[PDB]
Every structure is written in structure tokens, then in C-alpha cells.
């Protein structure tokens, strides 16, 4: 019966490939008030911290959400530095804080499956490609599709939040729709998943041509 | 923090094959109180109503969820009669009402794609099968896996609730893990989707072998 806030961990693609990790500390269901909410950051070593971008905007059902994103060093995160997001709101009696850091659990390499559908009736112009990532731990993972060595927009391919497998690990399914002109330009489509457990370079990829 | 309740629609598998479609009216976020909640049912035509089985249960997050399941005749639903669930709660000033009926939107037949995973080290006996159901309307759908004409339990296969594709229709992914002895018993496994748009008998299926 109280306001809560959630904190997220940086995605592996922003960590290893982009090399710019995104840390998000967000607050939710805040009853709108003239009180200003102050979000501060610190790290466990008590040594200097990079400034955080602050973005506050209202939401559709009327509850307020304020978010602050802090850029982090890649090695600072892999070494395990623990980060502290402090939220203070006059509505709350005492300050609220949330902490996060690297997970030390068992690591499982991601298994990548790239599948293409045969040309079936009624959709000559649009084709569908599916990707299945299986048996990876921890739950942090980022998946992407590259067409002609280019980063396709996030909107283009629909992905699924990780769910625990029936056996061991988690599995993620993603669906991509290719236009006729896309495979008309180039026929190689490779699905690659970035994950902390993954190696050599935290990348696992599989490609198969539209026709086997 | 007002309390709300939802009513659900019958699944196509319970509708077309089982011949017993059940509509469930349930309440959630119930603030626990000694006041007992009463749920009644009616149909729009004022025609007979079968008694609804009522089950009330607590949940992990402490909120009470109370459900009432009413069996409906398949013909009554295909005709399109709209059913009304009336919920009355001593805390609420006036009763609450929820209504449901058949969908009349455009209907698209489901496309089924069955995929098999290559044999990976450390799990020689157990393999993974994937199914993609695509371009179907409306978002009513139920999926099943048949192994040598046997229904594997719903729990065995992890499925995804339908979400709207970038274009027109919805897509559903389902993941199943096969035992060694099962494909030793029979090697063709059939992914079947039950949907209103599907025909002749509201079933669309494609099969995949575990390995060639």
C-alpha cells in the first residue's frame, strides 16, 4: 500500500557492442504532487560518479513516473561495482534507496536458432524469420537482427521477454518481417544474441539463407 | 485504489472440440474484508442460465481473487447471445456489471510453422521444438501439441499470449521439449492451432520430425 520504484540493469548490447551501458532507475504510481522528487546516485567505492540524465513525464492512466539514466563504465560494471539510486519524495517519511550490481550466479552460453519459413501461399511480398535463444543464464540478454551489416531499428523485430525453460535456462523468441526488397537486396540474415555468459566476445550468432 | 474485476471469453479449443465453452467472471485486488462477494449471471435474451461453479482463493501477493465459471452451450455462443456477469460486493455502493459476446471482426486463418532444434552437446536425448502461429484474427486462439495422436498436458509446452503484429494479425510462439523415449516411440510431432477462422473444422496443423 505504498509507492514503489524499480531499477534495471544495463543490457549486454549496450555493454559489449555499443560500449555505453544504460542504467535506468524509475519510480511509478506516484500520486502527482507539487513536491519535487530528487534522484541521486552513488557507487560503493564512494569515489566520483558520472552525471545522470533526468527525464520526468506523466503517464496515461494519470500516475506519475520519473526516470533517471546514468552512464556507467563498462569495466566498472563487469568488475561488480554496486550502484545506488536514491529517491526522496516529501510524501515518503524516510528516504528510499535501491541498489544493483553484477550477478554472480552460474552462466550458461546462449544457444542460437535461426529459422526461415518456406514460401507459403498469400504472402509473396512479406516473409517471416524466427529466432530462438535457449539455455542462457542469467536472464540478461539482448537480441538483434542485422540485414546487410546494418543495425535494424528496435521496432522492426518483435521480441519476447525471457521466460524460464521447462528444463535449464531461459528462452527468447523473436519474429522479424522482411519485405521483398530486403531479401531482393541481400539474402543473408543473421540472428545474433549478446549475453554476459556468451563468448568469445559475448556474441552468439547463427545465419541461414532464406532457402536451405 | 478502487477494486476491479475482469470477465474472460471461451477458448477455441474448449469451444470447437471439447464442446464445452466456459466463461469466467472473476474479481481481483479484493481488499480482504469479512464481507462475502456474490456473483450472479444472466444472458441477454432472458433465456435459461446454467449454474456457475464458484471458487474463491487467496494469492501470493495477499489479494483475494474470486472466480465464477459458467458453462455455455456452443450453439448459444455461435448465435452471438451476450452474457452478463453481475458482481455485488458489500463495500461497493452499487453493483458492478461485465458483459461479453462473440467477436464479429474480420477473421484470418492461422499459419502454423513447426521448427526443430539441432542436437546440442550435453542433451543428446532431449530436443526442443518450436511453433509459430501467424496472421490470425481475431486474437482468440488455443494451441496444442500432439505426439502420436496424444494430447500432452498444457503445462508441458510453454506458450505466449497473442500480441498484435506490426501489420495485420497476431503471432504466438510455443516451445516444447521432447523426451528421448517419446520420439523413440513415435517421431512425427504435430503442432495444432484451434481458432475460429481456421477451417474446415477450426484446426490448422503442421508436423515436424525430431531429426531426419
Amino acid at each position, epitope marked *: 500500500r505504498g509507492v514503489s520504484a524499480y531499477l534495471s540493469r544495463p543490457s549486454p548490447f549496450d555493454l559489449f557492442i555499443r560500449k555505453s551501458p544504460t542504467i535506468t532507475c524509475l519510480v511509478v504510481d506516484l500520486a502527482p504532487s507539487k513536491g519535487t522528487v530528487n534522484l541521486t546516485w552513488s557507487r*560503493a567505492s564512494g569515489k566520483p560518479v558520472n552525471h545522470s540524465t533526468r527525464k520526468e513525464e506523466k503517464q496515461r492512466n494519470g500516475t506519475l513516473t520519473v526516470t533517471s539514466t546514468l552512464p556507467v563504465g563498462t569495466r566498472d560494471w563487469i568488475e561488480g561495482e554496486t550502484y*545506488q539510486c*536514491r529517491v526522496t519524495h516529501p510524501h515518503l*517519511p*524516510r528516504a528510499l534507496m535501491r541498489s544493483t550490481t553484477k550477478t554472480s550466479g552460474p552462466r550458461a552460453a546462449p544457444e542460437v536458432y535461426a529459422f526461415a519459413t518456406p514460401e507459403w501461399p498469400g504472402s509473396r511480398d512479406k516473409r517471416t524469420l524466427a529466432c530462438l535463444i535457449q539455455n542462457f543464464m542469467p536472464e540478461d540478454i539482448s537480441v538483434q537482427w542485422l540485414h546487410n551489416e546494418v543495425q535494424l531499428p528496435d521496432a522492426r523485430h518483435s521480441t519476447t521477454q525471457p521466460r524460464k525453460t521447462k528444463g535449464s535456462g531461459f528462452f527468447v523468441f523473436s519474429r522479424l518481417e522482411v519485405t521483398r526488397a530486403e531479401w531482393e537486396q541481400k539474402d543473408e540474415f543473421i540472428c545474433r544474441a549478446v549475453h554476459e555468459a556468451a563468448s568469445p566476445s559475448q556474441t552468439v550468432q547463427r545465419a541461414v539463407s532464406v532457402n536451405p | 485504489r478502487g477494486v476491479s474485476a475482469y470477465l474472460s471469453r471461451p477458448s477455441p479449443f474448449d469451444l470447437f472440440i471439447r464442446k464445452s465453452p466456459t466463461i469466467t467472471c472473476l474479481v481481483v485486488d479484493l481488499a*480482504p474484508s469479512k464481507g462475502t462477494v456474490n456473483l450472479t449471471w444472466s444472458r441477454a435474451s432472458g433465456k435459461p442460465v446454467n449454474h456457475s461453479t464458484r471458487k474463491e482463493e487467496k494469492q501470493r501477493n495477499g489479494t483475494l481473487t474470486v472466480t465464477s465459471t459458467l458453462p455455455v452451450g456452443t450453439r448459444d455462443w455461435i448465435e452471438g447471445e451476450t452474457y452478463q456477469c453481475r458482481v455485488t460486493h458489500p463495500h461497493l455502493p452499487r453493483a458492478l456489471m461485465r458483459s461479453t459476446t462473440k467477436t464479429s471482426g474480420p477473421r484470418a486463418a492461422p499459419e502454423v510453422y513447426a521448427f526443430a532444434t539441432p542436437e546440442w552437446p550435453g542433451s543428446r536425448d532431449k530436443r526442443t521444438l518450436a511453433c509459430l502461429i501467424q496472421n490470425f484474427m481475431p486474437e482468440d486462439i488455443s494451441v496444442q501439441w500432439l505426439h502420436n495422436e496424444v494430447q500432452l498436458p498444457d503445462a508441458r509446452h510453454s506458450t505466449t499470449q497473442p500480441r498484435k503484429t506490426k501489420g495485420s494479425g497476431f503471432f504466438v510462439f510455443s516451445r516444447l521439449e521432447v523426451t528421448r523415449a517419446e520420439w523413440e516411440q513415435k517421431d512425427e510431432f504435430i503442432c495444432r492451432a484451434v481458432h475460429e477462422a481456421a477451417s474446415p473444422s477450426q484446426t490448422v496443423q503442421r508436423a515436424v520430425s525430431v531429426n531426419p
Partner: single-chain antibody
Amino acid sequence: QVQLVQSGAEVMKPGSSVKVSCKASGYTFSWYWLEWVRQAPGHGLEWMGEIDPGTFTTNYNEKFKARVTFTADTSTSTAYMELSSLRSEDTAVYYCARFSHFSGSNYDYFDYWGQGTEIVMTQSPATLSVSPGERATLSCRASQSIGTNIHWYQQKPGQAPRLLIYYASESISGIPARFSGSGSGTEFTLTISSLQSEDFAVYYCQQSWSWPTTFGGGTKV
């Protein structure tokens, strides 16, 4: 990567000054409230006090207010507790606590290396020794209805109480799924699906609803 070092045990006789130091590593010493809890052999854990090093403000229990003294040191990230009016009647082990929290009052994350030579609940059943393979349920009921603001701690003999369940419903990571908690209002139940000699310890009830914070008598297995 967050451990806290309490001070080495020291000799005492009635009427002598005592100082014990709690050191903080792995988190910013200034931002989190520190707390002091007292466990006396044969008595459930009782609230001793708390201190904020960021503002140097201090809070005290009803009975220990005048006896106890609280201070902290920001530069080295160390905080120590001092006490007077010592009696052997006040023989107990004092576990130093941190205050990780959501809103006003909450569970604690702390280590325990300090030994010195009121809206309370009912702890039940009092004690039960090892019995393998049978589901074990521990019951905690508080004098004033607590809603769901309750916590479960596990102290293996000689170590720090380790937080098991927060808010009685959901378990902290790393804990096996066999431990489960449920309840509402005044009543709460902790259920172990299967009991194994691997995890044997005392389990203490926690109430943050009102001041001072209270702990159950405990149940050892």
C-alpha cells in the same frame, strides 16, 4: 560485495564503559541508516536503536535511550556504539544492522560480529528440533494488526541473521523455492515444503508497522 565488520569481543564487568565499532564496506556509509539490535541468550531479539550518519541524527529505544550512546565517522566509513550502566543482567550479543528500505520502515541487511560479555508479537511454536522430510510451519501473530509489513530472518548458530522473506510473501534471491511465506492481517505462516538438515537455524519474526520495531521469540530447528 557488501559486508560489515563489527568490533572484536572485549572483557566486561558491571559498571565499565563499552565501545563497539561497526564498519561498512560495499555501500555508501552516509546514505543508509545504521541500526543496533540486542539479542540476549534466552530472549528474542529486541530493538536497541538506530543512527543516520548522513545527518548525524540519532534515535533510541525507550529503555536504552539513556544507557546507550550512538555516533558515526564519515571519513573512514566506520560507525561505533558506546554504552554505559553495564550490568551482567544486560549480558547479550549485539548485532549491528543496516536499513535498506522501501518507504518508512523495512527489513535489514547486516552482518554480526559484536558480542558483549512494546508492540511485540507471539512466536509459535516455540521450538522444534530436526525432523526430516516433513513440512514445517512456523506461526507468528502480532498484538496489533500488521497488514503485510513483516519480515523473516534466519540466523545460523554463530553467524548473522540472514534475511529470508521480505513482507512475508516473496523471498530474497538465492533462497531455495521450498521456503514460502503467506498471511494477512495479524496472522502469518512460513511454510517449508520439505525440511532438510542442510538448513538449520533460528527463525525470527520482524514487525516494522510501528515503533519500536519488534522481533518474535524465534523458532530453532
